[PDB]
Amino acid sequence: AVSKVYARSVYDSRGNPTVEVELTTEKGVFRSIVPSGASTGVHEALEMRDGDKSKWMGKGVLHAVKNVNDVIAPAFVKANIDVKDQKAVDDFLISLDGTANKSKLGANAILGVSLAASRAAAAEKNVPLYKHLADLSKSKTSPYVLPVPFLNVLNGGSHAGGALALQEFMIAPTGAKTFAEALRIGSEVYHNLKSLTKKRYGASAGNVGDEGGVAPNIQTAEEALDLIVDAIKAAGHDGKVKIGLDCASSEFFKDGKYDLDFKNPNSDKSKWLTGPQLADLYHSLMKRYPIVSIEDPFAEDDWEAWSHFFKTAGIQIVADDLTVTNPKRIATAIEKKAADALLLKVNQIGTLSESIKAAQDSFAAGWGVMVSHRSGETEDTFIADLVVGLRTGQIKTGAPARSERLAKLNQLLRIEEELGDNAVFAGENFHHGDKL
C-alpha cells in the first residue's frame, strides 16, 4: 500500500531546479527525478516553471512541487492504486490533470509519481526494475537485448557555446561484442577526441558542453566529423565505431528555411538553406562518413521535408521534436513515412504508460526506438532500466563524461553483469533491437 507521496526541489546537471518525487510503501521509499530539456519541442507536455525572476533565475518548480504535495498526493494516497497497475496509476494521474498537455498540474509534477510507482512495483514483485518494465510493456525477456550507447562526444547547437550549429555528434560502438566493450571503446575514442580537440583548437576547446561532449568553436559538421574519425582511428577502433547525428534542426528553422549559423547574431540569412538543399547536403555527409543515424534532420512540423528525405535516406532516421514521444504525432509520422525511429523521452509526454505506448506503436510500425536522456539530467538512472525493459537496442544518454551521463552507463554495466547469458548486445542490429 502507498502510505505517502512527497515532492521536493532538487538540482539538475545545469544547476536548475527540478522535481523529485518519493513514493513510500511497506517495501520502502522509492525516488524518481524529472529531467529537463533545452532544445524542447514546441509540442512537449508542459514543464511548469515558476517564472519568479527573483528565485532560481525564474526557473523554480515550486508550483509543480505544490501540485504533487497538495493535489496529487492526497488523492493518490487515498486511492491506494496498486502500484503494479501502471495503466491505472497513469489513468489516475492523467484524468486528475484532465488536460491534453498536462497543463493543469504540469508534466513535471505527474511524471515523478508515474516513475516512482514503477520502482515500487518492481520491489513488490522482487524483480529488477528492467524486468518489471519488460512486464509492463509485454517485452521478451529471453533473451533481453542490451543497447548500443550513442555517445554525444562532440556537443554543438544549444548544448555548447560555439559556432557549431548541429547539436550532437555521437559515436556508436556497434562493432563491440558486449555493452562493457562498447563503453570502453567509447571512452577511449572520447579521450583521444579530447586530446586531438585541444591540440587542434586550443586547451579550452577541451571543456565540455551540457552533455559532456567536447565543444570546439568550429563552423562546419565536416570539421567535427573529421575530428571524430581521427579519434576513432587513433583509439584503434576503425570499423567498430559508427556515427549518429542530432541536427535539432527546429532550433535553426526560420522562414521555411534552415540557418546553419543560428547562434551568430550576425547570421547571414543569404546562407540559409532549404528543404531539398538540406537533404542533398545530408546525403553527402552520409557518403563521406560512417553515419548510421540522423535525428531531427528537419523541423518539428516540416512533414513534407521529412517524407521526401526518408524516401531515399537509407539509414535510421530518428524523430525527436517531430513526435515528442506522443502516440498521436507518431501516428502521423508513420502515415507519412517521415521517419523510422522514435526518440523516447518520458518527460516529453509525462507518464510511463504513454511512453510505453509510444514505443509499442513505433515497434509495430517497424520503427526503432532510441531511449533518450534530456540535456538537463540528474543522478536518476531510470532510462537505463527502461531501454533494457523495452528491448530497443539503442540509448543515448551523454558523452562518457559528467556523471548524470555515466550514472546511466554504469547502471547498464550492472544490468549486463546481472543478465549474463540471458542477454545479447544489439550491436549492428540496434535499429531493430526489439526483433532480435
Place this chain on the structure above:
Amino acid sequence: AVSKVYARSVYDSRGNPTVEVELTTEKGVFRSIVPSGASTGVHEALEMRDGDKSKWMGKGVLHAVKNVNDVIAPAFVKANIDVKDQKAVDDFLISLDGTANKSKLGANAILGVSLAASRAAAAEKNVPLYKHLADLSKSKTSPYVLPVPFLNVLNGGALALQEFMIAPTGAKTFAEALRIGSEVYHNLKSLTKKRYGASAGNVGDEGGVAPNIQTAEEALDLIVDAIKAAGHDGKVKIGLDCASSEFFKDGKYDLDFKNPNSDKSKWLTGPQLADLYHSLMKRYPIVSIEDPFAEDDWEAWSHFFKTAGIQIVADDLTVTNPKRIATAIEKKAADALLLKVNQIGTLSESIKAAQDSFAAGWGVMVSHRSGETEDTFIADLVVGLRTGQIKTGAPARSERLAKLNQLLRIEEELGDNAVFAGENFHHGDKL
C-alpha cells in the same frame, strides 16, 4: 553476516575507470564507489592503475578490482567481521595490505570495502548513513550541523591558482545556501560568456567555468560582479585552492607556470607569495585558502600562518593522513584539514584524521576529488562529522549535484534537529 564482497569497474565523471565495491549482508547489497584525483599529492595512498596503454589510455583498474575479488573478499568473508565495528573492518583491511601507503592492494581496492561496510552497518541499525557516521565518530547530534558548500565556480591551475569557490555563509539554511550558490553561478556563467565569448561558458572537470584569465585579481573581480549581479553581496564569501605544489619549482613559486618562457626572475619566494595572498585577502571577501604553499614546504606554511587571519586549509600537505596532520599541528602550518577519504584509503583513518584535527582546534572541510562519481558518501560524512563545511563542486554536473541534493534531503529529514553552520563553518564541530 557478510556473505559476499565484490568489485567491478565503473566510470568516473571524466570517463576513466574506477573501482566500485558491493558488500552483501542479510540486509542486502551495499555499494560504494572510489573517486580519483588529478592534482594528487605525492604522499597520497596508492591509486593502483594498470598502465596497459592498449586499454583505457592505461588507466585501467583491473588489478585493483582483482585485489578486491581475489584477495580481500575471500579473506574478509572468512573473518566473520561485524560491519558495525568500523575499526575492526578497517583494521582487517589495513593489516591485509600491510603497507604504510596501501601499495600492495591499492587504496582504491581497500576504500570501497571500507565505505560499503559502513553502509551495510547503517542498514543493520536501521539508521540513515549520516547518523551511523556520527556514531562512529562520536560526534554531537543535538543539533546536527549542516555544512556551508564551497562551490568551485571558476577554475585555473595563464591563471595559476586552481579553484575559486563561493561560500554562501550568509544563508539561513543549506537549501537557501544552495539556491544562492546556484544563482551566483548562473550569473557568473552569463557574465563569462558576455566578456570572454560563448566558448568560455563551457565547463571544466568540476562544473566551473574556465575563461582565459591572466590573474587572480581578474578572476576575483569577476566573481564579485557575479555575486552582486545575483543580488547576494554580503552573504557570499570566497575560498581559494591555490594547489601551489603545481607551480612549485626550484624552491620558488611560478605564478605564470603555464608559460613555457615564464620569467624565472619573477618567481616568488615563500614570503613574497605570502605578501600577494595578503593583498588578495585584504581586498576580497576571502575566508578560506587551501594549499597556499607546497606539499612539503613546511617553513613557508608556518611563516604565512603567523600573520594570516583566515582559515588555512591543508590538502596535499596533509593528505588526510594523521601522521602528516600531527606534523602540521606541531609546526603550526595550518588550521583546517581537507578530508579526502581516498587520500588515506579507509573510513576509520579518515575519521581519526578529522578527530585529530578537531582536537587541535582545526576545522575540517570534507572534499570531493576532481574525478567524482554518482556516489554520495561525502554528503552523509560531512554531516556525520559535524564539520560545517564541504567542497564538492560547482552546482553543475551531477557528480557534484548528487552530493548537494543529498544534503538537501538530509536537512529536510533532520528538520529542527539541525542547524546551518553559516559564518561559523570553521569550528562547525563545536557549535
